[PDB]
Amino acid sequence: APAICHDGKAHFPREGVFVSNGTHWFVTQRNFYEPQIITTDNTFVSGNCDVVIGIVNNTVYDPLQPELDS
């Protein structure tokens, strides 16, 4: 997929691309297979979702939520 839409905002990978074996979505580097969980760290936000062609609805995870409880 080119990008992922969460709340109308469109996200892009900091480096590498998104893939999925059907079960879940992942972000990986270019020359070697090494998936990692999607995050607001290795992604960035720019513009709304409507403009881009071929976007896919999903959810972006934020690791700060479990930590801010303490």
């Binding site: 080119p2 990008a3 892009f12 513009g47 403009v51 071929g54």
Partner: protein, 49 residues
């Protein structure tokens, strides 16, 4: 893309390759998508000339 020169050919969507080639010169790749149509119509036009 470039990969077939390096080793075996790997399929890749064309818009993705355009985005990479934009990264190659220092323009954040999102700029490509929010203008895709426009760029295309220039390419087909420019080659026409």
């Amino acid at each position: 893309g470039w990969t077939f020169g390096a080793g075996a050919a790997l399929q890749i969507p064309f818009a993705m390759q355009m985005a990479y080639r934009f990264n190659g010169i220092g323009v954040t790749q999102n700029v490509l998508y929010e203008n895709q149509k426009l760029i295309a119509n220039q390419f087909n036009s420019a080659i026409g000339k």
